[model samples]
Target chain A: KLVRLPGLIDVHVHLREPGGTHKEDFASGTAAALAGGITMVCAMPNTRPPIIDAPALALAQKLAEAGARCDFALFLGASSENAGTLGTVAGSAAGLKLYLNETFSELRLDSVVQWMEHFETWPSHLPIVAHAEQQTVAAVLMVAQLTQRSVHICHVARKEEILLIKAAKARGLPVTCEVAPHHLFLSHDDLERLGPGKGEVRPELGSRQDVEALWENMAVIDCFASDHAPHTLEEKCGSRPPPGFPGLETMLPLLLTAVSEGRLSLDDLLQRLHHNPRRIFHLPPQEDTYVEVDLEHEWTIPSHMPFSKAHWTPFEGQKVKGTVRRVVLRGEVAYIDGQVLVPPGYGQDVQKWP
Target chain B: KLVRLPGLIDVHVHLREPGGTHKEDFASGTAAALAGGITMVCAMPNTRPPIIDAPALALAQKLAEAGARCDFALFLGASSENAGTLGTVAGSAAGLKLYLNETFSELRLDSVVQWMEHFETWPSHLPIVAHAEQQTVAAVLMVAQLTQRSVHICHVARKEEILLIKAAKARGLPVTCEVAPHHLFLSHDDLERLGPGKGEVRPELGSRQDVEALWENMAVIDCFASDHAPHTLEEKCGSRPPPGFPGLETMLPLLLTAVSEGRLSLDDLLQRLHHNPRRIFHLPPQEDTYVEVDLEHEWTIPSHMPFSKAHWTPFEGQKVKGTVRRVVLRGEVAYIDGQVLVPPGYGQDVQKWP
Candidate 1:
């Protein structure tokens, strides 16, 4: 039977545009995102020349406007010297992405106090998205207390981190966090398929205990983001392959499988994908965006069919229980029967929140 | 082409003698231990009428002296009421085995302070071998601090417990611990081979991180024991299969495999297998006893043909890179080339330590 659901929103994806276009560009990434049932995505700002200031933000915005086939929002990277950008960042972008810990992108702020001081000037409605590990998560939450600014933690992977977030939420801190689909679906037990680099992801795959903890307490996790980073086959198979897995195309199907297995419910899925993201980021309602999936149509994720320019995926061998039959972007048929129908530039830029 | 090593000693084993002979006895258990390359074994005291008091200990002692096929020392079960046995427990037994937590037998002490206070009266030379979880290990360490008793923790499983033990040893607490081979080699990742009951072991297998930590810090881990609990084929396959897997015959072979793979060194193997157990339990030094092994002969562990009465093993189907070729127990050719070379009653009772 066919099932219809509202279009999903992914808040943590790297389209790798404005630079590093060899890995992925707006046209390739958004096509994968749209075909995967996400009609809108918030692109991370850690490209070759990261979107740390107004000029970089304008560059990313222009690239998406020229070639993206789905609605897009860009995150401006927060740097030690980018405090001035926060004054006007909200006028044209989604939010400020703070890298408080190590990642491929070299923008990292080691001092929690400095990060707190910087976010203290940011607009109240926009979220201060922080990339964090367990210790980093604690520092960010403490800083959130100081600034009274709502903080959105990206890619929470550990049980300790989840416990910290849960305790903060219990104390009524405006702390919101998201887990990547890979963290939920795979553990260290899946190492064979994940191969040598160990899932090739930021915040490495946790133990089975941590994996179970993530599933048991999903209510504490506000939403799910793909953390969809892409790298070429050569780069991934080389001596120093980068961390990250292409996830935009597989997040929904795996989640839908969880629903069929009775581990998740439809309402919770919608809340994580649409309701919570819209409310947290002050995003507009997607009245016309939706996707049609054959609820029981099972399919194996192939090695070669993904739309991302990386031409590979960590989820290559996993079998998913549901298949996206069609996807709609901005009330138009963007993907159907394995073909992308929408032309480039049909996607609209998500403007400033109310 | 063979590598020779000193005969192995297992500090934790269940003979189920006197009352539970159908499962195991001095004759069958000692023969199995000999064939498995162990010349000395400290049998557990959790039989039907457990060796909790003087008469029970005498009964077990007589049985081993009369029919054992290798050298043997028994561990007298410690309970809240067994404080009276501590005076003679050190005279005849290897050490006092305290079941501070749950196990096959119901003999356990609930009070941490009481268990410590009771062990305080024990002889300085003999160790208090403890079967405990993380919380129980913490309690026992505090009690060791209060009473100044050198404690020997049995079957240490969790990373948290290992960390606690490491800290206690660093502060010069005279704390020692032995991890089961199952704990070092297996994890929840083995659930597919282990099935629904999940190895059915006491102090159940921990996460992958715990397994790695155990291997990484083998020097801190005092020794390796089989926790060689054997159960019948019928009971193990039943709806309520009891906890424990037979390790008597597999422990040396597995450790030898670890040596061949470079994950462990021959020195550490001998220390964990022979030197530490004899020293911590104050057993007489092994003289004129050794086992010969082919260090590179690879083979899969068969489900059948195990020497334990259980006639099965959890390590079945696991491939090993080494093989035990010959065993000498107390200067006699006890086992050689996959056959028991000595009679069932050839073993002698191990006398007092000093």
Candidate 2:
């Protein structure tokens, strides 16, 4: 069976560029996104130099423009140092990515006052994307409430976190949240199975109960983000493994498998991956952008990733239904079967697009 | 320095009556409340013969009318078997108490369907008070949102639970929550000091971080409840200690100490202990009810409780800065310094009063 759908948009991905390109750069990362049927990815700002200001954002944008094969936008990292200047790049970037919790990034905001400074100074037209977990999620929502700014929570992994977001939406707070595929499909059980260093990811895989909650309260989730943070396999199995997984390539097949199992509807998938992402980020529509999938295709995920330089996936060997057969970006064939046909600079910056 | 305030209300309390009277009976429990400067207490329904119906409610009402020395109300217990029949006793009871989490009670409802049944069938005007912890707290809020019925979460102890409640309130959900004095004042650190079993309480004392969070988000807390579940020290120290602590006698002094330390404002205290509790439970106004306190009085909490047959307290030996000097209930001096002056029959059933 074959199905045609709008090109999926992943609002969360870390395309290491102008920094740690050995793990994954704009080129390989965007290639992976196309393979997963994603034509646009909002890249995270937690690079080596970090994208905390206009210059950093421009630098990352330059990198993406040179190597990215899929349409992309870069998030400006929110930090105590940049709270005063983040608004300078507001319209030029995707949104302010506030790391309210610890991650591989040095951009984590430790105090509510710091968060308030960013919330207060950042342009209200653009949403504030928060990398928050557990109590920090609640704190972020509280800050959003106090500042009256719209916030999109990234990678909601816990039952309490998602429910709190549900309540925030119910109360009419301008808040939305995304659940990563890893949180939806994998759990602590998988963490144990994948072994010590290899299993690590931020907002770590929760209990089976937490995964059930994410599915049960699906209505509360506004977007589905892969949080495609890719780290090298050597580092993953080393003494101190950096947290994250290369998710740009696996998100579609895993979600499609869920759809095959009746866990989700096609309409719901489109709402999260396309409609909501477009609306929330205020992205310009990509005319004639679409993806063709072989819905009946079933195969095991290989040990070596096709494009991500991370070289491996936690989902290795897992069987999944659906395969991206072709991807069209703005009337041009960007990917066909296993090959990425578009050149790096061919992909436009979504925020800069007219 | 003496201060006079309206008689405080504790919306959550367990007076072991009409069943297990050895630990606490109406006479003794009411005496403890009077000593704590609390004139109104809504008793929980997890007794020997739990108050799941009108007959049980009436039996407990009769017992309270005969033995209680202060105004009182009783809650009707919610069980999987009683969801359909809970509304039958609506106006006659304070509220429906649903144990979504396990307690030393036979009324815990394990399924969301069971919770939905109660939420769907129960009278919407009256709030459904839930004994929910962690994820169950989120579940309760979600049910409240789905049914559009008001819910009062009992003993919110964890950081995540209170923050979720805060978000629920912000989202304008008809939800309210009470923070037990034990939760606000004591934590796991104290549990370690109090030794095994002695410090055990439901929604167990959270970490210092959790306690800090409760204080930090005080604005989100609607009411102050004693959750005065009492068990004899012998039982508490036994192989299996039933979770709970006698709180009625310690509530006021602890809160007053908070007030003295500038941790809480006098107005905030009144709102949670009197105004919000009165409005949430819909109890009749006590015409001339007031309590006079010696604000500067300092005394050590005794090991043996003043009135509760439980005989011991978790707060024993702690020096507190406030003392209840006098309690006036409906034009009568019901209690004097260290003495409950009113007779057992003087207390009226609040729900039955005009």
Candidate 3:
């Protein structure tokens, strides 16, 4: 029998709800998470109404309970419009979202002080997550010094940026970083070449050298996230561009690619994709076990394979490192041999945190 | 007696002159061109000091004439700095190049009228080439209507931009267009997934839909160009963007990919790559010459296999349709099964313009 580990967790995802059902919603998105062996995930707060208040939190909580087959939680977006400010967003919020370089106009950065104040709302155990990118180390350090709190950085993909994160760690400010599978594996040239299809505002992929550097810093990076922001061909290939590139199905393959390249070990990949996220997000661990992956298979990236409403992924036609042979989530087969075994709802609720 | 056609004339390439030699020089770049069965190529002018003047043009011409294994022509820069002043820069220049979306900050562009007037130095038969993107047709047509001159759109890569080009064609403008091998095979998603090592760019690879659309327009496009701009790893794989992909060696395999997809007919690709470029650039027909292509060979795109200065290409790993086994220009073997016999600087300058 394969040595089974507990159920995995994903600390970040944007499974859009209520308003953006066309892109993705609670049921379909969580089902995708289940495919990658993620039994728990922390959804970001930049949803339709922006989950920055008690009512919104209640709604999100209800969604997680009713629809999430796996255990789940969500964030409260940091905003000034709310009366109690960020603290009013909710005590359960993972942290304040500082969009250092949020790709879309809606996700753009709000005021720094207002953002910083949110850290004070919660205890030091929670992180103030920032979607940091293209920002200078000094600037990030300045925010660190001011907040004097631990910050979880989103998508530490580039080699130079990974180095900068290391520097931030050395400086003694509380900074935890996460690398997206797409960012860690792909380089800038790929982004430039595929910018229109993948949507360019997501920071450029780093070089092989940078990818190697990312590998070196894997231990230091707190976790891995799918950043499962989905965009349709209509939106991505459309004249007006918003952020896209769905994350769920390709997540395992991306991790598998890294493992095949020997950039990271299988143990490390499992930790990054599963365990580290649980630890960082404070999600509870589950009794569920190992995800059996076939490392030696070859498959082209399929055009219409996404389990999410966001059917397309950025890696089309690419020979990914591996495909999920059988993802046995919680002793039940969710995906086996390129097919989903259980229907969508079986994998949606009772998410395992930590 | 093999059926004879013109040794291919590639309208796009780079010899990486002025400052970059670590990657490639006129000799190596042109040698690779000849090796790939390209008899004539019009190279781009965005090197050290930028190819904005007569001396630079003369220097490039001298180098190609002195050391190039294949016949060569050039695209002289028509910039805001050197538009009307290009009166002296005409004869040796195959056409005037204007960058609508500048690939490198080092290169600049001319205003529409200023660009149009650069053609005033020559007659209606001469072409003004525009890197037409983002509503650039309006400018191309306005200039053509005013001067009653011909304009050729350079590097039509993105599929979405084709509507504008199609509309321009429908308007009875003398605006001709060219698509490259890179644009024909890959898409934005390839880079999004492959990582930076493969995804270097000038204009991005558009959607698969766009690539499909381009395959449909292959017959109508003036010709197929390799846009073989060579750069070393030092320039391309980071936050610093490179000007183009290394296509001189890989161009044919990419054409073969079209045939394999059944999106393009082999005869059509041959016409686009050989006959059409000669016509667009006004090179005379050399159809009596023969190219014996072995259609069944397969190759992978990896670093060690590449002869260009750049270590990576976006199209690496993709299987292509056509493979050149032997190419004979005027009864002498030019390239034989990936080995060169004629060497650089020995072939007669066969002027086969359309």
Candidate 4:
């Protein structure tokens, strides 16, 4: 019933800070990560005052250093305004996050020129993480091919997206993609049940067939990111709710369930969660980091969990088979039995690692 | 200005004969083709009682010989029941049409075994035309790669489907695909205007973004097909409407409009509509066949067309720039000024060519 594995790495998560701490900040967000057995999370840059420039990146770094309960890295959001200058701050961030499509943020890039500037100017060593959907996925891959840069697509949900990524990889293009747990486990069919407000998310839940394609072509997928974008329950119930879900706390359990059911292999899980994330983002390894899981545990997901301040989950009430019992971060037991053991400031920025 | 070009070939169309003659029989369907300047059409085999056997193929051939006004060929529908024996009748048909996904027909194949049986059993010289969408498109490509059989995907409408086919072709996979004019010109945005009844179609209309992808990756596309499945107005308006559109009459005008607008080149149109269809389907050249078009003429499409029995059109009321002025099939004048000049039995099966 007990299983131990390398600490998971979720290269995509929105730890809202600097302006929207009411939903989730570095502390609560990383606490949720520890609870999910994820030792390291690369936070997205779609905050109220996005982490686009050096000042914004520094502000997010300060907040994470002061409050994050697990190892973390920051992504500097790519904007048309910062297309030329983003390379200056590439050293301090995990990767350049390009919003090639609309998300919960206003940082969308529509022009190929804007995409080319980022793809051209950004350091080739560091990947460009794109929030691209459907045809946009093809566009970004094309940009990557044109620029010969390593582009890692975020939250590839549809069958088309993954298949395109698969084809791009087969053609020897330096393109990688991550599939969010939400896209893998949930689909448009769950939307009516989740209701309009709760059901919403970007690269919106695809048809059941799309989900099956993701599973069928799992080899093409490089990373398993949570895309842990959290909005308050009140905000979710509002007439115009933001798109995204609280995924940091649920990703591991969901994958573990898939592994238990034979839909996924343990090696494939680690490949996406650990090896690929570290390789794709060029993250420094957390020596001796691991997670202890109760693979036989069965429990219904709660709407109000302790770590995630959002107090709601799209996966609420769904019975999951696995639970993160304990997590060790850099040789220390950082999380156990629904509790984050480390102090907020104990987490270090993976980008700052020597 | 008048422009003369090679006789257009529609590699995909449903001339519902041997059954469901009330909607569109070989006579009316071929008349529609001739009026639209199409000298040849490869008919789909999803007719009622279906065309999975030699008897049905012979019956369809009898009907086309007696009534069709244009040169034509027929597809042998692949069903779970006839997958193994489909090769026996391969010489008599143009291709093996596998409904790997749901369409207006009951001939969907859900099992890989069924697809493999058809892919393995069907002669490799003749392309296996598939009604595969999204993930199923990827599946069929995998089967083609595994079996080393040629596959021509029919009516690739979505960004994902076409992009996957593009990737497959790039990887040197023997795969080709066609794009329907409806998919090229119409999308989900037009659904409300066309109404649910008339707007309905298989591989259903994709988003505006998907349509853009199809145009953007036009180089990867091998053929342009009508997928001209006709249903009665009464049946379309009924509570349970079938998914299809009457396209034979509208395809050329739409493409020519795109040509006039500079969105498409005349050479590209000819490659897809004439050259590629003939090459991919092994269609023999119709010696001395040509279509005269008034490229500068503009006209509004009407609900009632002279040739097609299907009175309604999804493209009705749309203004297009080009008009088919004359059609010559094998040195004989077949159509001129909206009138089908040929007799019902003028058409010959392309498969029977010396």
Would you estimate the TM-scores of all the predictions? 0.50, 0.52, 0.47, 0.51
Worst 10 residues of 1 chain A by lDDT: A278-287
Instruction: Give me the runs in candidate 2 sitting further than 4 Å from their true place.
Output: A1-354
Positional deviation of residue B250's Cα in model 3 after best superposition, in angstroms: 1.3
State how far residue B66 of model 2 sits from its true place (Å): 0.5
Question: Quality of candidate 2's docking, in CAPRI categories?
Answer: incorrect
How well docked is model 1, in DockQ terms? 0.01
User: On residues A87-162, what C-alpha lDDT tens digit does candidate 1 reach at each position?
Assistant: 8567577788899887778889867766976777777556679998979899888888776566899999999998
The DockQ of each candidate is 0.01, 0.01, 0.01, 0.01
Using lDDT, give the best candidate's number. Answer: 2
Ranking by lDDT: 2, 4, 1, 3
Query: Ten consecutive residues with minimal summed lDDT in candidate 2 chain B?
Result: B278-287
Clashes of each: 3, 2, 39, 0
State the lDDT at B53 in candidate 3.
Answer: 87
| Candidate 3 C-alpha lDDT tens digits along B244-297 | 778888886677665667665554565577645654565443423456765666
TM-score of chain A of each: 0.97, 0.98, 0.87, 0.97
Question: In angstroms, what RMSD does candidate 3 have relative to the true structure?
Answer: 25.1
